[model samples]
Target: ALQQLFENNVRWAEAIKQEDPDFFAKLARQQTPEYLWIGCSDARVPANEIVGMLPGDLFVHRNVANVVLHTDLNCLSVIQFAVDVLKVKHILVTGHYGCGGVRASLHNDQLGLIDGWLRSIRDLAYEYREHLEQLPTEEERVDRLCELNVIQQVANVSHTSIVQNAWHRGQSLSVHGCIYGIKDGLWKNLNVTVSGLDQLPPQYRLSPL
Candidate 1:
């Protein structure tokens, strides 16, 4: 019921307050989170809990399969705000194994609105089919796609003008690709991190000023 949901909220707040009485009051003053999380909208992965971060530590944006697109104004807006306003030091693009979205994209099943959203991942799967097909089963392929999707998003975010501009002005920021093992409950950094404009393509490095 709505009552129970609200009750849960109250209890959680009270429990947090019990440990640190000044938490809520202090949080009201300012929010200077240093990390931004871009991940899948999977209920299994609680962004803050998995990373051992408290309420004010992480800024977040999530979508199915963790796909980042130039036309996705919502995701772009979040990145801009996080990098430009919050000056977040790291953007973690984290995906997880057995992603429903990735699995769905592996096949041509028509699932309405989400089909458009997952199209990029389908294209990616096709591009890497030779590699993904070598895997033994669909499950394994999905997991590989999950990893590839995160890596692609890391580049997508890193290539954004918001991030490049931040680097151009000598801001310290890094975009990292990562994946979580749902069974193991552990996050692995894929080690595909982009730190500056120089790490990107030479011809496309816009805005030197």
Candidate 2:
């Protein structure tokens, strides 16, 4: 299987070269993508393939359930670099239906250390327990929570100091929420886009510098 992976890589590189001999050379030189994809760690949700974008066309950072915690330095570092250095125009926080993380949180599964990381999802579910309890089935509840998680992360990203500072300086940037269906293989925009400080709640918006 390891050898097969290597063989596949060779074939893929050859295919790219055959299509455009200078593709790799150009990619090796620089990456000037305009979109930053913050998505789940699910193997099926390949960021580039789903969006029909090439390797160098999108900057990406993935984690469990596509969460963007205020305390997560790794995610925040990526955001800072993408905004300050890459100057990505859009940051898309994409989650998916039937997410293992969301399901685990819904069931209160004890997945060792990851339970701490997934605590936010559980907290979110509990905050909306009334609405989630109204769902007819656990499946629907998990799917809805997945959507809500993306919406929350979009707000989280929009509230970040990095994004707030970018906006204060008049940078053209937008944070969006999206969700994907594993069965249908389609992405649905949640229509929760925050373009500037005016869009965020007063408490979430940063003070003018």
Candidate 3:
């Protein structure tokens, strides 16, 4: 019943088919993407638009604050499928400044129901408060948490069995954490790149069979 949206899709499909008559057919056959994006659900920070990637180019999983938990089945399945099925080579955990969930965690604001999803980040900020509190302002504190969360989420993803097993098999995979500012419209790397088992702690390392 959404005529405008329906019309938009029809025209979009027409444009792509015009570009390549076999494009949609090949898309149905298979997709082999190289990147897995774990990022926030903020409307302003869409993975494809921000990264200038067209459809079928990137695999993405989004949530509040971009938090990654070891026990999250939905996120874990997405990672497993991307690595095992799609053979994606890079995973990027990205966060954006002034994220509503992050800003709330910085001050422990009351957001019922959703708080459970973000509770880990709240505790994360607690452990890093020494680094968070000296910022002198809510704006600065929230930004630091954004950066911290991205780096931490990257660590979490790299530690997942899906990724660790890939490395154990000598897969060429790399994980990175980055931040994007809605105001600036640029993706900035946080420099916490995990190329393989070399960057992990000894305990995190799993031996190859």
Best by TM-score: 2
Weakest 10 consecutive residues of candidate 1 by summed lDDT: 200-209
What TM value does model 3 have? 0.95
Task: Give the alpha carbon lDDT tens digit for every residue of 1-209 in model 2.
Answer: 59999999999999989999999998889879999999999998989999999888899999988888888999999999999999999998999999999899999558898888888889899999999999999999999999999999998999999999999998999999999999899999999999988898888877967
Residue 167 local lDDT, model 1: 96
Which tens-of-lDDT digit does each residue in 70-146 have in candidate 3?
89998899999999999999998999998889888767567799878888788888999898868898888888888
Candidate 2 Cα misplacement greater than 4 A, ranges: none
35 in model 3: Cα distance from truth in Å? 0.6
TM-score of each prediction: 0.97, 0.97, 0.95
Candidate number with the higher TM-score (1 or 3): 1
Q: How far is candidate 3 from the true structure (C-alpha RMSD, Å)?
A: 1.4
**Whole-model lDDT, model 2:** 0.93
Residue pairs in candidate 1 whose N, alpha carbon or C atoms collide under 3 angstroms: none
Candidate 1 lDDT, 52-137, residue by residue in tens: 99989999998888889988999999999999999999999999999999999999889999999999999899999899989998
Overall lDDT per candidate, in order of appearance: 0.92, 0.93, 0.89
Model 1 backbone overlap count? 0
